[PDB]
Amino acid sequence: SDLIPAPPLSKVPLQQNFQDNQFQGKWYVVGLAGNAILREDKDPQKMYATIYELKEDKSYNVTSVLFRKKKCDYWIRTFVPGSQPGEFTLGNIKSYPGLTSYLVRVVSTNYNQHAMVFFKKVSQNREYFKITLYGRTKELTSELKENFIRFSKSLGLPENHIVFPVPIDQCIDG
Ligand SMILES: C[C@H]1OC(c2cccc(O)c2O)=N[C@@H]1C(=O)N(CCCNC(=O)c1cccc(O)c1O)CCCNC(=O)c1cccc(O)c1O
């Protein structure tokens, strides 16, 4: 319970001209980074997928699907469009005990192969942040991964706080 501090928002770019319609669909967490994320060579992190669906009201219904304990687990929540396109906050924050704040900023994407998204939440008074490298496929070029590593580090994260989940087939195909 000691955390590297969330970076200031000025160190987190925002994708220009955000096309919310084009960001829809399944993305693969190809890379994971944040102040509560730890590399664990004993029990390495399995890849998971996060599906974004625009509703009529242009909120995202966001569903993450994870292979856990031999089953598929579904983490569902809503992203509400925020201050500027590419930026979001969390709907029904009341239903999450201890949660007082939640921010999403799409750092970059080209929509049809890769994306970088930054998350910042304050739960139980602790400030957590993470960056996810999203891939439309389960594998990305070494260039894009090093860019993920580089950017993670520009925000204070050491290497043991940067993770590339191992590709799996169960649950996240479909
Ligand atoms: C079944 C689990 O899978 C997920 C999950 C699955 C895919 C992507 C996510 O962002 C997820 O949170 N959440 C579930 C979960 O119970 N936890 C532990 C509970 C603490 N989380 C929360 O209180 C929470 C509340 C509202 C929205 C969220 O995204 C939240 O994480 C999650 C604890 C792990 N969280 C983090 O490492 C984290 C770190 C920084 C920022 C975040 O938004 C984070 O979720």
Ligand SMILES: [Cl-]
């Ligand atoms: Cl803790």
Ligand SMILES: [Fe+3]
């Ligand atoms: Fe979360």
